[PDB]
Amino acid sequence: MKLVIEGTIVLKTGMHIGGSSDFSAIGAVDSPVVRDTLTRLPLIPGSSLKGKMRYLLAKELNNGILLNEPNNDQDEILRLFGSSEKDKIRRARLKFNDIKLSNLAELETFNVSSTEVKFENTINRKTAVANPRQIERVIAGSKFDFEIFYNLDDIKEVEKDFENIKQGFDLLEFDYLGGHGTRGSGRIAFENLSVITAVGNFEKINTLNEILGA
Amino acid sequence: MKLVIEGTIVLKTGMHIGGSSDFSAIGAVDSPVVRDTLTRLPLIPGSSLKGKMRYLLAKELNNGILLNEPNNDQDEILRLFGSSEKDKIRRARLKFNDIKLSNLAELETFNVSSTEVKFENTINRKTAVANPRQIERVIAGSKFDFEIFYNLDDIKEVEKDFENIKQGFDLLEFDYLGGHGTRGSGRIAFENLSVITAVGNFEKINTLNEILGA
Amino acid sequence: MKLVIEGTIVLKTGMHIGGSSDFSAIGAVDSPVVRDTLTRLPLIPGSSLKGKMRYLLAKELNNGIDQDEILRLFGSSEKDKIRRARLKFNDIKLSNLAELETFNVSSTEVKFENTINRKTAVANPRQIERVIAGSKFDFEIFYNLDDIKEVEKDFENIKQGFDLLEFDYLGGHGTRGSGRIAFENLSVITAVGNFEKINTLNEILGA
Amino acid sequence: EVEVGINRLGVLRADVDNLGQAFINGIPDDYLSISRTATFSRAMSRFFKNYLNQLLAEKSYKINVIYAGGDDLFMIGAWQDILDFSIVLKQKFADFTQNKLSISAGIGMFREKYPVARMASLTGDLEDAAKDYKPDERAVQATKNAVTLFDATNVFSWDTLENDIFVKLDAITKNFEKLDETGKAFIYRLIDLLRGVNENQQINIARLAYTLSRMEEKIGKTFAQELYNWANADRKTLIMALEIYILKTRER
Amino acid sequence: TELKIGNEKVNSTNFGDFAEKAIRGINHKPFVNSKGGEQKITTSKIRGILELVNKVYNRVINTNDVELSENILADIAYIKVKIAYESGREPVVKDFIQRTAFTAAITDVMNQRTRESFLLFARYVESLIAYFKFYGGK
Amino acid sequence: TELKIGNEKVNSTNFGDFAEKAIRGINHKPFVNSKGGEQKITTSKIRGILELVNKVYNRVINTNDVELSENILADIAYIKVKIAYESGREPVVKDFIQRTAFTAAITDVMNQRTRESFLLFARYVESLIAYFKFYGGK
Amino acid sequence: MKIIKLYFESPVHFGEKRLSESKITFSADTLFSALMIEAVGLGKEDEFYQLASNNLVKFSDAFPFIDQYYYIPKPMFNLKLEKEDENPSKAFKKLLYVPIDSLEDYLSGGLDAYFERESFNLGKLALSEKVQQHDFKDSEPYNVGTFTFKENTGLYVLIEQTHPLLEELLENLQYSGIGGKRNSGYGKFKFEILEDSDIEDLFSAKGNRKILLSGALPKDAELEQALKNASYLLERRGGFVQSDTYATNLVKKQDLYVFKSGSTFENSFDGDIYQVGKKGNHPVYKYAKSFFLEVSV
């Protein structure tokens, strides 16, 4: 059995995820955001979402401290995100996906594009001279509908898996996703968190929703 | 008699299906994909598709547990994908073929290339220092027309064989197709599935075509 | 009295025929392909094509229901029913080097594969040397006009074997994606003697 | 019985060079006697038969000698045993004959079901390729003092040339046992790009640049540049020593 | 092949040696600024050169046309424009661009208009960065 | 993709060289003041012109649309208006525009209306700024 | 006289006793067997046997040719007139084939021993690992000894007084291959009758010593005459009868022992076409007529 965790990621502040492939002009942008190559639609890579969620959850579950290596995290994190250790390989019960922004029509109703330009600078404390940059940033109010695949392997510890999934989601809500988060950017929110059966039906699927929506 | 199963593998997210080295620079593409060597077109190996599909079907024909060798999995899996067990050699009914990118012209309609470079990194936790990595991925929206030959050893198992084939295609929907799938990549979809008779006119190919296309 | 059947084999998905055990490294090509002894160009041995075509025809003309057709077309020596041959297969050398060199690409590729353990989930990276797709192999098959009545049935069976090879593979790990081929330029022209019905034999292969 | 190695069958065909000439004119005319000729003949025969038996019985050798007799030698056994007993055979022959008679060998790798007649014929023509060795094509007759290592074209020697190849083999074995276990994938890269250097040279200098680029905390770049230093002057020597090292250390 | 540099000629076989020679010439006698020098270019300033070249290398590495397309040629010309622009910003960059004749190689690539020429140029630049590594650091 | 700078058509590969020609021509033979003086256009003014071009380029570039919509063309016509205003205010800016075909280039983009035309115009202006920074200095 | 040059387009298997090894040349009994099989194919085996048994078409075996250098197996000279100088030892032992124009130079001495062998390079022997695929049983790995020639290299056959029937048979033998695995992808060649001028002088010459150029067996009458001051070598010519219309099963033939094609004689004998298959229902023949090259020591 396999389950699909749907939901939406709503940007609270501007969100920047780096990665640059071509044509950064000399007066326009210095750090573009990652975009879907075909449709040019900005996206949240599943790698970055998975990594931030794993970091926050592993730090929270262990002791509040996290200095180890990913293949030596706690057993919940190891069983939910995977482990490549030689003799102890845990197959990941989560398959994150790349997350394109869904409410572009809603944004176009407000006569705005999905990305803004943010003008920053650093001020040399010696001479008080400013060095300007130009960060492309996905505007607040953008919504990213996602889908995370959960491989239902153990029928009994699925509840603890989903409690930790919700805990990691809530840790992201009080943190940033991608880019210069401590300097204002990156704030996000989660909504419409619902798990559904990929094929067939699961006995505790009404329980797994109420431990996701609450 | 021989049947040909046609379809399209459409990339929902970027796919990193390759492992071939093609004289890569230090920081250009740290992980390239497999391509057709002559036409440079991106390629889905038939071995990769066959192996992932066999894994998913053999696990989902138990269900949920698969810890044995490929030759001890299941009569359905052995008769569909092949067994080399010394006591009972089984000839595979499915002949997978390497799959090339079909809609390159449709990609050029959007002035986009066939692949992309996805910048990732890794954050150490005892030192909090990143470590980049650039992996090549075929663009989401790429389409791969495939033909898989099926041979009728007996027509009393063809209906269940196509049940299992459609099931494996469905299980590939909620998994990835080889690569960094757990971290966003590899999500695919199956479209325009059909089965036709290579030579002759199979009597009950309408049931097979209505069960492949659902 | 002698017929030569020309034609070209086009590699569609890459082909790995044969194993020549020599010059292996830690990475290596764990399984190389057959090549010419002198020019080192890859080839399809006439034995490989002959055997795979005979396999396809024997499993086709029988369907679990060898026969006279297969024995008279490929030969026989089993215990009493010694039939000599009518088809005389030849080694097929790689024709596309003028074309393959314009792409600045070698005639062979190294395909990277792995098997993943189902208990320990541990991979195992194997390398398979493979003749790249789009390679062409112009061939010749000599047919001996032992009997003039059976020519049409023999050539219908030859075309059927070619067609069965079209929906199959020719060498190596085919069910894992390799070894798909195609045929074109399929013509038969009498080499010695004069066959008045060479037109219908060309129409058999042309179809 | 091996744990790390290759599943190949190695053979040896050692033939003393110019023994017939050592009988026709090797012994001085002034010192020509029936007793002296008989002494030399019996010494050579006893050497071959008896001392091959005793040298193999001295310690644990995985050799199943087929023929010793006289002036000839056939051996079948573990591949690494053939390789490491070839040197023992050459040094023992040099010691017993006081460096007066040259010897040639030939080693071939075969499967567990390879035709033994084909084994013998291939090893014989490799032996001939070792017999017809000449550093320069100016002097009359061949030096005959050479060994062919798995190929008729790979005619190495027993002199300072084999000294160099074995020093390289020992150094590579000592150094390249303990890498990062991840950056070792460049070894097959080097092997398949140095398989023959008469073609596009771009990738060779590119690998040189990559080896220079590789910069972390390791043994350093002493041996990482010694690879480059030995990659130009000794091309066939490097490939032969590297392939011997790979076959010895292959996890097969 | 046939990549003009200004004083010599780097063919497809001779990019790494010239790159190491140029880096040694850079490492020897460092740059002279207003205050008599003397600091050397940073790893994240030859970075920019390396990703600038790779942003076309990734698009040319996987193709089979002998001559570069008009889209690739435009991006190479844009690389030339960018390297001209950034050299005016910092002098420690301009000496790197001059002592290692980037501009002549780019212009010859734009004159040859062939895939192999740009591959050789990219190999030369990559070897240049690789040789800056293992000599300097930081 | 074929701009009409002055009397010579500009394609997608000669933008850098033609912008270099424009900057060197201005640098070698500069504008003469009314009051018997010599001065160039300041870096602030050309940077403001580039910013104007960067305002529209930052929204055009994040698209796959072949032809620019009516809003982009309206913004381009407004930028042409501001070019005329700057030319009318300071005669050095008018001279800089006239020696190049910056007005003629913007008119060609306005007449072509395609995305690629404005992309080439942005490339040309970026190269003008690049070769000002390289040649004029700072 | 009439050098028949055979140019092979595929590696050949000319096996001597087993499939795993191949030799570089085929003998004259092999060629006569091939031509007799062709003649049975087009229904004139009787006229071919009459021609060959009446010496109207007598041929040597296949010798190598490299770049218009016609080669011959090292003649079995008694070497009684060379002990004065040169190397009367194993130096002239690895030498397998000498050129046929330089034979009188070799016979009188002065031909380089080392130089020839590296000069004599025509392709190389090859392994060809094959199998018999079985659907459920184990596959049967076997290998075929093959041999590929160089680009400008092949075999050449000496024929006196070429015949229209022989020309017709050699056209048919192009498309049926020659050698071991000819119905597999191995036997394949094209030929040129190629009359030659510097060669017919060697066979119009005279001399005391005669060089046998075809594996021949003397008649019972002249064995005593031929076995006088002769330096010969026997070889067994047997194997299996290759025909589907013989003895209704796979039966061997009477092994025949013939003088090798490098032997030297003082007395010229004319060999015989030997009935080696008698219990079957067609005459299996061993072509063992004699083809000589007279020289003078």
Ligand SMILES: Nc1ncnc2c1ncn2[C@@H]1O[C@H](COP(=O)(O)O[C@H]2[C@@H](O)[C@H](n3cnc4c(N)ncnc43)O[C@@H]2COP(=O)(O)OP(=O)(O)OP(=O)(O)O)[C@@H](O)[C@H]1O
């Ligand atoms: N006492 C004596 N014994 C043998 N031959 C003698 C003697 N005095 C003179 N001669 C002459 O020498 C040659 C020998 O040629 P050959 O008859 O071919 O005989 C073989 C072999 O029987 C003989 N042999 C081998 N081992 C011994 C020993 N232990 N003692 C005596 N004799 C022995 O030598 C010949 C070996 O032939 P090859 O191995 O091929 O020679 P090579 O050194 O390998 O040459 P190369 O390939 O390196 O160039 C006759 O003329 C005889 O009258």
Ligand SMILES: [Mg+2]
């Ligand atoms: Mg000896």
Ligand SMILES: [Mg+2]
């Ligand atoms: Mg001997």
